[PDB]
Structure 1
């Protein structure tokens, strides 16, 4: 089938900057999937906003094909307030699939170290290098 990267580009909101490249989008989706296996993830606007307000640190991934736009139009400047890097991807179905849920989600906040279990700590250690290189490539934009 057609990939959701090329499919959802007409639906991308005008303020969806920075937008990930296809290789970067694949790396972000893989990192989100590994973090969801680590359970080091916040899904949806409510959880992401609450975690940002408490002071959690990580990476924010925002879907681009969001209608209406007032669902997510406060997230990027709120991430800038708390010094958290963010990046936009064009598809919310892919974000939900990588975020270990059946239905699509709007925004994902990877917070490393958010799981109390030791198995979650080991999974954090194994996806840590991918998370670090993704964050460096996002901040390089």
Structure 2
């Protein structure tokens, strides 16, 4: 499992600089509302009744790909090292990068893997 958080934090961290991640309650509701979602990164260290209640609700409602990562360094380095949070929503979307020679390849792959795994489990 330890490796999971690694590969995960790495994927999101890479996309974070590629403008593919969206943190903040606002970005969350918007990602699930506009349909522009990807991976719900939750801070294992910070998770109030809000996330603990929305987790089973949003999951049992639509079953969105939500993952947890107990590591402030990760959640922060992914969302914003300067302004870290506990609720983040990744959005691996690329039009040209999809078929272009970019990190999107390994990124999307590794991401879809970790994400899919979290959903199934």
TM over 0.5, shorter chain: yes
Using the size of structure 2 for normalisation, the TM-score is: 0.77
1:32 to 5, 12, 30: 12
Structure 1 residue 30, shift from structure 2 partner: 0.4
Using the size of structure 1 for normalisation, the TM-score is: 0.68
Verify the 8 A CA contact 1:39 1:114 in the aligned structure 2: no
Name stretches of at least 5 consecutive residues in structure 2 with no aligned partner: none
Name stretches of at least 5 consecutive residues in structure 1 with no aligned partner: 1-20
Structure 1 residue 116, shift from structure 2 partner: 8.4
Alpha-carbon spacing, 1:25–1:95, altered in 2? closer, same or farther (3 Å): same
- Bigger radius of gyration among the two: 1
Alpha-carbon spacing, 1:63–1:29, altered in 2? closer, same or farther (3 Å): same
* C-alpha distance after superposition, 1:84-131 (max 9, x if no partner): 211212133420113343232112211111688899993423411111
Counterpart CA distance in 2 for 1:131 and 1:71 is: 22
Structure 1 residue 42, shift from structure 2 partner: 0.9
